[PDB]
Sequence to fold (198 residues):
Amino acid sequence: PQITLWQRPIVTIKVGGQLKEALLDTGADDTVLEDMELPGRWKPRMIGGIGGFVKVRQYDQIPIEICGHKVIGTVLVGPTPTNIIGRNLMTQLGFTLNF
Amino acid sequence: PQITLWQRPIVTIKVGGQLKEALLDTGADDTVLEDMELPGRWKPRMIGGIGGFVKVRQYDQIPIEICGHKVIGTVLVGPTPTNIIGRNLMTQLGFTLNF
Ligand SMILES: CC(C)c1nc(CN(C)C(=O)N[C@H](C(=O)N[C@@H](Cc2ccccc2)C[C@H](O)[C@H](Cc2ccccc2)NC(=O)OCc2cncs2)C(C)C)cs1
Fold:
């Protein structure tokens, strides 16, 4: 299917057993979710964006369902204002930009 | 054209006579450029990002060529690591996300 950009491209995801809404974001290298618990080891990281930087925890090999399809990759967790699905997971679903 | 997302979706733009690089960003409502000179008056705007909020200058009705296509719209100028083409201008080109 085709997703329009007249509105924010927000989709439902399932991660860590929880259902959430998240923004499909071609301008994000990585996926960043509002603070939550995830299984396994993690390492601290600083990620930068428009307002400056925030400290997050990086969990690797985390499974996520997006649009029902199951993908796996790195997920950063911390005080982000909204959940963001980055290119690292978008590629796994075969997403492209077209015009 | 079709753009995959294994690397950052960077395109060439032309604004105020100058060629620049910019990131195609579906997760951005608006277009934000690094400090530069633009004609006309500006008005104040606060935009929010991952790191919080920042003051930018809002210039309305600015012509930009993106991939040689002319768009005319609002451009925000302020502190940013990268020029960002947001949904306001991506919609003028007819960009969609597809999988
Ligand atoms: C130039 C160099 C430093 C670059 N690094 C990168 C890799 N990096 C750091 C990222 O992708 N970082 C992501 C990001 O913020 N990307 C950004 C572009 C950018 C990149 C680097 C530095 C500054 C801005 C752009 C992202 O789409 C974010 C997503 C978002 C949306 C709402 C709330 C929080 C976040 N969009 C926004 O910040 O919107 C700003 C707004 C515009 N108009 C109204 S609000 C994080 C979410 C992970 C790309 S270019």
Observations:
- The interface with chain B takes residues 1-6, 8-9, 23-29, 32, 47-54, 67, 80-81, 84, 87, 90-91, 93-99 of chain A (CB under 8 Å).
- DSSP finds one helix and nine strands in chain A.
- The two ends of chain A are 14 Å apart (CA to CA).
